[PDB]
């Protein structure tokens, strides 16, 4: 099989060049006893083809034993076509790059790390129809570099019936832009849409009446059932009616699968459609071998058409994570790009916009600001927002003074003197302080 | 968290008799410095509601540290329902049960091993509307206990043009019941559905006509877009006109996802569904710590609907499987059966179909029926049938031959004497033969 | 969708990827499917962009059954030819909603892994909102050519 499907002679630079191939570098390590370029090329041979059958084989063209690395190159021609549009699909670069060679039997584990696209295959990607350019637009901030908008999810994240969810939301918009259901909160009987949905709606109003600010809300649509995704993507618009446009779609797409991001995508494009990553761990963990990295899932979501994804808090929170992540916002958010193993042009596909959440807080985002190199996030902070002092609305005041601090170059502690909201934060969060900010109650005037 | 989202003292007996939770079982290992009860404690909170918010709460009911057991119980009314009909959704189950606690900081893995749905639940979920006893009939076999179908997948997997693949079809089916497509192949530019499916068409109709046997096909429906799955499903429909009952509907469920299983049953619920399940091992290794087993997911894709599941070959062929892996095929078939941590009755719920593929031959079906304890099985042998030295239609028989040898408990070397497809079996098989069947060569003289 | 997803198709910069080449086939009606395809080929072995005139669609004389899927052997013959990415328009105006998503539906089914390189050509001055926001609210992934057929009532110098 190694004289079939493999090449290590090949060039990379020409394999880019040709723009005939799907290029993929993964981890990979042979069961006991396997030699390492006969498990790859196997891997390449049940990822591919199992005369003219020969010039589809996906060809092994680079392996390193030592570190465990092998790369394949997938004819373009193997990837499967919409017979409505003509246009590719993520679940057939996901069937054949990672599927059955993750259960051969002579492969102790294989992982996928990065992906390179083509020019026409990037063409026949759906791609985003909405960024954060047009949350910017609304908010009434420049459509470039517009940078943070401050948001929540609603605590306790499921439990609360449709009175007093509604109230929460309106109380943390007096103060913030964007709320959104958690990943499991839908049509559950204690709080059904029907009911909450529109007293939501009034908050917004309320919220956006009393501020001279508009709001933004991100509602899961995430079911099985196709038509159950556009029966509440429907009633939504319907409710919001002129405001309609603030309603961001919230997908389960990892659990729910490309299914469901592609019906948000297509049936609703003028939607800011949110990827929620939610189960991802199972094979994105650090600890984990096998399947496909953070990275390499935010790239696709892109792909997809995702209008925004979540990312974690690259080590400045809690969960899985680290400060070596800030390349997978890099990667969904520029035009041109250099992944782990490959340099991606984008060619004006709209950016996926990376959403923090996890972990932080006003004190904790100028360190990440500085690590990311800008603002241009959504940052749901549900921690950051109720975990403050005086309020939630407060909270979501005290990120934004934080974001525009770091903006400013500011000094955080003087930052402080003249910013109530974020001075409280220090008082709301004081181990973060104390690690951050060592001797800020006597510079502040706070107490011991 | 301990004190609100577990109590150890709840008896197990209770949570199934009340019917009012859905239970789960882990493994679970915590993160360093990290106690085992707050880390399942934190595990529920994350998994479910993070005065009435109590009702709902998910609760550690039970664990054990020294074999990294714990077993939450999830209040039924946490689970999302549809606007639509009320049903509930599998997506939900994946979302609270094992979506975000996957990426937990102070949880080092996490994988459900087995779950019990209620009586209410049960009756909620779609379930499969048709199975095994549908295509039985199509073939003139008894309804009940009709057994073995004989089946393969066209070799190469991907890569023949239209009429070479109607062609290895044609050949096929003039000795076995059952062909369908690899879980790529679908409309590639090299071989598009348009010119394929009507010469496949043509293919059934002439060995049908031949042999006065029905004979089946299942199709790839798989698409991103849900709109492109139901144009090919109605394509396929319209083509095979008189015979349209006999297509099935093959979907790439695990990297496809809950979207696309549910696309296929409730749009085409008269068609039997196949479910693929491609790039599972990601998480179903016996390697993997995390995610969901084998069985899980089987249990799983029979209340989303599935007519029959990928199983594999249980230690009898290739790939990462196992003896006691039969316990997937009773759970999925039975109406009464003992998971590894929980007894569910499915109260009259349609079987999933066992799907068996993955280096099975003539040779080895005989172990295999004797473990599983009967042949009510699709099995898609590639190998099996373009493995015989005679034809693919040969093996096919070879394969029937094997489980009719069985199933009449006859000695297999006595078989082939009286059965030419079985014995040249022997023969294209050697290595096996002479493992499973020391001595062979000379009781059914055949040379050296 | 924009120029620049045009220029993006034939490997041109996304920004400032300059002059697109094009044309309408002559005699802009009367011609046979055949007739009509050749044209096309002939013209597409140099330029880029081909449409239909504005009121050119579905006469008896040259149906869309019958010559698309000939325009379409055309665009690949001239692609295959010249190693360059080509561009058909194609006019889907119509009174029916659901006629214009026919000849939608058919054309992109016709291209197939070309689809994404058809324009749909609406007549949107005369054929009013309702026929472009059809194309661009259900085909929105496919490039919107507006033409403005009739304008010249009220937009001459002469108008007040
Ligand atoms: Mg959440
Ligand atoms: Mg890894
Ligand atoms: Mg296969
Ligand atoms: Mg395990
Ligand atoms: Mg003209
Ligand atoms: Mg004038």
């Not at 060809?59 to 409505?84: C, H, Q, S, W």
């Not at 932080?360 to 959504?378: D, K, T």
Request: overall charge neutral; glycine content about 12%; some cysteine.
């Amino acid at each position: 099989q190694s004289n079939r499907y493999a090449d290590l002679s090949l060039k990379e630079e020409d394999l880019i060049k040709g723009g005939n191939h799907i290029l993929v570098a993964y981890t990979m390590e042979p069961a006991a006893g396997v030699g390492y370029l006969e498990a790859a090329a196997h891997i390449a041979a049940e990822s591919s083809t199992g005369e003219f059958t020969k010039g589809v084989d996906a060809l092994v063209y680079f392996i390193d034993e030592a570190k465990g690395i092998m790369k394949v190159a997938y004819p373009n021609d193997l990837f499967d076509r919409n017979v409505t549009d003509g246009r590719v699909m993520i679940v057939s670069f996901l069937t054949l790059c990672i599927g059955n060679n993750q259960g051969m039997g002579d492969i102790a584990n294989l992982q996928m790390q990065d992906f390179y696209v083509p020019p026409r295959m990037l063409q026949l990607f759906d791609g985003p129809a909405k960024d954060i350019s047009d949350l910017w637009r609304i908010l009434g901030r420049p459509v470039k570099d517009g940078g943070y908008i401050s948001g929540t999810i609603i605590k306790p994240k499921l439990g609360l019936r449709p009175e007093p969810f509604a109230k929460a939301a309106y109380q943390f918009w007096l103060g913030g832009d964007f709320i959104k259901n958690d990943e499991p909160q839908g049509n559950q009987v204690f709080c059904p849409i029907k009911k909450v949905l529109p007293l939501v709606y009034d908050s917004l109003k309320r919220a956006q009446d009393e501020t001279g600010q508009a709001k933004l809300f991100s509602m899961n649509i995430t079911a099985d059932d196709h038509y159950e995704m556009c029966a509440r993507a429907d009633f939504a618009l319907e409710t919001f009616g002129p405001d309609a446009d603030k309603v961001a779609f919230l997908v389960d797409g990892f659990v729910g699968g490309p299914g469901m991001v592609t019906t948000a995508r297509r049936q609703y494009p003028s939607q800011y459609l949110h990827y929620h990553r939610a189960g991802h761990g199972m094979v994105t963990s650090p600890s984990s071998k096998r399947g496909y990295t953070a990275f390499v899932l935010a790239k696709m979501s892109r792909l997809q058409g995702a209008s925004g994804i979540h990312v974690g808090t690259m080590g400045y929170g809690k969960m899985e994570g680290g400060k070596d992540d800030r390349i997978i916002a890099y990667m969904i958010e520029r035009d041109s790009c250099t992944g782990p193993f490959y340099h991606q042009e984008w060619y004006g596909m709209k950016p996926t916009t990376p959403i923090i959440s996890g972990g932080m807080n006003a004190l904790r985002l100028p360190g990440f600001f500085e690590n990311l190199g800008h603002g241009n996030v959504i940052n749901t902070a549900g921690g950051g927002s109720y975990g403050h002092i005086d309020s939630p609305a407060a909270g979501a005041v005290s990120l934004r003074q934080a974001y525009e601090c770091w903006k400013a170059g500011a000094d955080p502690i003087e930052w402080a003197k003249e910013h109530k909201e974020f001075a409280r934060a220090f008082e709301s969060f004081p181990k973060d302080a104390d690690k951050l900010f060592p001797g800020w109650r006597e510079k502040l005037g706070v107490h011991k």
